[PDB]
Design a protein around this ligand. Structure first.
Ligand code: 1N7
Ligand code: ADP
Ligand code: MG
Length: 265
């Protein structure tokens, strides 16, 4: 049932969810995968249709930027990703998973539910800032608004994007800095949690939500503990220009690397 499924998704973690889907059905969304496999390669916008998404609403029943993605896939992937998560559970930079098999039509379909992810992923931010198109940029306005970078009336300005006719735009982009820097830090934690847990895999941007949590272990093969290896060639390099467009390291010139402390002399 469309309500029993939602109540199961809520699970132990007490939350109130509004289904962005339609009656326990997959929600088709247009994202910015950074993909490479036998057939397709590149950093493009694909159309993902294997994730039933619910949005959490806090007290006052206001929708907030925290979702419950419920990706459903085959049983072998279910087992493999459950074991990989169990190995990587203890890290703080890993979105809290919840694995459960549910009655849908005629068989127990296994759903793995990522809890409290942001709407977009770091790949979406990188793509929006790297493939800018002034006439069609709705996934950049939404990111800039939902994280209080600007006021949603900044976009009524005639040139809210020009770097030469509106230098103040930089001050807006810099308001993402402390949201990017943290992400970087969390990667260095997640990478460590792999190196210690002996897991070999490729870190792609489209798996890290804007908070920083990493939530996909589909192609993570495991090896002898303590001898894992994260591959971050295509993560730090695609994310590279955003570290100076949004001045991500500007918090390193404050004593104790705190944005409230005074400057280092
Ligand atoms: C340089 C790096 C290897 C370093 C190493 O320490 N190897 C030790 C042994 C690895 N094992 C197979 C045992 C190269 C060669 C082996 C490669 C990965 C494997 O295909 C597993 C996995 C299969 C998926 O379908 C596709 C992605 C994965 C993550 C690949 C990524 C990357 O391209 C690896 C890590
Ligand atoms: N055709 C497919 N149908 C359903 N699931 C797939 C398919 N191809 C790959 N997958 C699984 O989905 C993962 C990629 O999905 P993705 O869009 O990244 O969701 P997530 O970001 O939650 O991992 C792969 O690691 C694999 O386990
Ligand atoms: Mg993924």
């Amino acid at each position: 049932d469309a309500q029993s499924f939602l109540n199961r998704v809520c699970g132990v973690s007490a939350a109130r969810l509004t289904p962005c889907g339609t009656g326990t059905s997959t929600d088709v969304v247009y994202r910015a995968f950074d993909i490479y496999n036998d057939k397709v390669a590149g950093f493009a916008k694909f159309l993902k249709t294997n994730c039933c998404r619910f949005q959490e609403k806090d007290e006052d029943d206001n929708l907030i930027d925290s979702y419950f993605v419920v990706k459903r896939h085959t049983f072998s992937n279910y087992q493999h990703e459950e074991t990989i998560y169990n190995l990587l559970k203890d890290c703080p930079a890993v979105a809290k998973h919840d694995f459960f098999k549910f009655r849908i039509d005629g068989d127990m379909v296994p759903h793995i539910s990522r809890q409290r992810l942001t709407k977009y992923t770091m790949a979406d931010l990188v793509y929006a800032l790297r493939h800018f198109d002034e006439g069609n940029c709705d996934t950049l306005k939404e990111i800039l608004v939902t994280y209080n970078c600007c006021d949603d009336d900044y976009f009524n300005k005639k040139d809210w994007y020009d770097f030469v006719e509106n230098p103040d735009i930089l001050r807006v982009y810099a308001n993402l800095g402390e949201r990017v820097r943290q992400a970087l830090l969390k990667t260095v934690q997640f990478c460590d949690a792999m190196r210690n847990a002996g897991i070999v895999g490729v870190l792609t941007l489209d798996n890290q939500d804007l908070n920083g949590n990493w939530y996909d272990f589909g192609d993570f093969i495991q090896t002898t503990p303590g001898s894992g290896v994260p591959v971050v060639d295509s993560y730090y390099s695609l994310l590279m220009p955003i570290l100076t467009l949004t001045r991500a390291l500007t918090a390193e010139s404050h004593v104790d690397t705190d944005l409230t402390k005074p400057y280092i002399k």
